[PDB]
Design a binder for this molecule. Structure first.
Ligand SMILES: O=P(O)(O)OC[C@@H]1N[C@@H](COP(=O)(O)O)[C@@H](O)[C@H]1O
Ligand SMILES: O=P(O)(O)OC[C@@H]1N[C@@H](COP(=O)(O)O)[C@@H](O)[C@H]1O
Ligand SMILES: Nc1ncnc2[nH]cnc12
Lengths: 172, 179
């Protein structure tokens, strides 16, 4: 499968950092994928192929990416798909009238029309709180949340239980 | 020229927000470019064309993008060029051994970082960010590229606040797409 082979090669590119940011935490650094345009293209194509597989006759209108590491691939995935990108940002970073969701995250009220089909993207799901907030913001837009797309998922934290929409994680 | 037509259309897409984040500050919101894949592609192509024009027989090895709004287009520009992307992040966000460069905001001397292993010495680099204001953040990124022993070919900005004279803090040449 094209997705599995790319998922394996991207897994190998990850760099493990014991005890960062603090004692006990194992940091999965996906940044090495972005320094190699071959690997980066594979990550984008992997997500693209999955969305083509999951949603063959459903038009995606936007990728919604979470600040800050979702910004590293979300916009690029959006452009690969030929769709818009919209950020979900931390509190007080977006100008103009915003909707708010507590975790505080925000989205711009004018960014996405009602009835738009949306995919939320982020590097990793841990507790799920940030992703859940993004979902609340998509809901306040009256937009449709087709799926959450993550690069990594910390299964032991049970982040997906806080979420309503279906979840895809590329590297399990 | 293609650059200019795209620059005009991207200028029109910007949304002005008076008195954000505080009184007196005029916020230039470039986020409307990213909601429209046509506009987004034009921004990427504009930068691509400019780098092809400025550096026709010089291989760019990396785009270095500043956190957080440089992340919105830097990686995508990197992939369009067929080159690596490396982030410059705020203090304590990058794992592993990092180089450090100081910058000041208003009531604070905060800190940027880059990963020591990210870029080899002698790599040719373009630093990218949404906007240059005081120039402090861009200057810090330059100090990090220098600690890498990498070559800073150019700074590339979407917008520039000319009245702040941010350019004067920088050593390498500067390109701003929307003047
Ligand atoms: O799943 P939760 O809400 O616990 O965390 C989500 C992650 N938090 C970010 C990293 O944490 P931060 O650097 O913002 O403190 C990741 O990029 C993901 O968005
Ligand atoms: O030119 P300076 O150093 O004054 O500012 C650079 C800008 N500051 C960021 C926004 O500032 P922040 O939202 O972190 O307060 C922009 O994306 C640019 O990087
Ligand atoms: N006027 C401004 N608009 C957008 N971003 C900024 N960063 C610093 N000053 C800014």
């Amino acid at each position: 499968m094209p997705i599995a082979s790319y998922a394996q090669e991207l897994k190998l590119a990850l760099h493990q950092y014991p005890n960062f940011p603090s004692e006990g935490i194992l940091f999965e650094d996906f940044l090495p994928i972005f320094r190699n345009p071959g690997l980066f293209q594979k990550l984008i194509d992997a997500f693209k192929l999955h969305l083509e597989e999951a949603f063959p006759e459903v038009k995606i209108d936007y990728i919604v990416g979470l600040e800050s590491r979702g910004f590293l691939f979300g916009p690029t995935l959006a452009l690969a798909l030929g769709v818009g990108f919209v950020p979900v940002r931390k509190a007080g970073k977006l100008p103009g009238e915003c909707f708010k969701a507590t975790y505080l995250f925000e989205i711009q009220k004018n960014a996405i029309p009602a009835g738009s089909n949306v995919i939320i993207v982020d590097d990793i799901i841990a507790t799920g709180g940030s992703a859940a907030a993004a979902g609340e913001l998509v809901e306040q837009l009256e937009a449709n949340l087709l799926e959450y797309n993550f690069v990594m998922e910390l299964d032991f934290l049970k982040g997906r239980s806080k979420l309503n929409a279906p979840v895809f994680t590329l590297l399990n």
